[PDB]
Amino acid sequence: SMRSIPELRLGVLGDARSGKSSLIHRFLTGSYQVLEKTESEQYKKEMLVDGQTHLVLIREEAGAPDAKFSGWADAVIFVFSLEDENSFQAVSRLHGQLSSLRGEGRGGLALALVGTQDRISASSPRVVGDARARALCADMKRCSYYETCATYGLNVDRVFQEVAQKVVTLRKQQQL
Incomplete structure (x- = not known):
């Protein structure tokens, strides 16, 4: 008989400078492109999670989340640029918006x-330290922190794989 391939719904939020679109594109394709928006609206990718195939659905929002997004997502990935304070501050705002909708x-x-x-350079140095970033992680709840290098693929697969596993683990706990 046929056996279900379960679906996991991963939303992604962040400002235009965040690198969220390049992050998604890199995960899906294995290649780096500089993007302020994803080329397509929605993506899907079959992945192993703890040795079982899942269908991972991925969608970024252009800006503030909307009601549909908020009621759809099983998980949300918030993204900011380490060299842009405004990008980091945007995450707080986006998280508040998400929470009040959901x-x-x-x-x-x-x-x-x-x-x-990806945007860090000698002329655009890192401005968000991991102490401040991990303080925000702690504030947001059920959150893990990563620093990624989509240009060369550093930590990209990990973010999506680990978030997918988190969704599976949480659903298992709820079932029991």
């Missing part, structure tokens, strides 16, 4: 916070 009837939301390294 409400408290849906149980825990698996999260990631991702600081991207």
Whole structure:
């Protein structure tokens, strides 16, 4: 008989400078492109999670999350640029917006916070330290922190794989 390939819904939020679109594109294709928006609206990718195939659905929002997004996501990945304070501050705002839309009837939301390294240079140095970033992670709940280098693929697969596993683990706990 046919056996279900379960679906996991991963949303991605962040400002235009965040690198969120390049992050998604790199995960899907294995290649780096500089993007302020993903080329396509939605992606899907079959992945092994703890040795079982899942269908991972991935969608970024252009800006503030909307109601549909908030009621759709199993997990949300927040992204900011490590060399842009405004990008980092945008995450706080986006998280508040998400929370107020989603409400408290849906149980825990698996999260990631991702600081991207791709725009760091001698002339645009890192300005967000990992102490401040990990303080925010702690504030957001059910959150893990990563720094990524989409240019060369550093930590990219890990973010999506680990977030997917978080969703599976949480659902298992809820079932019991």
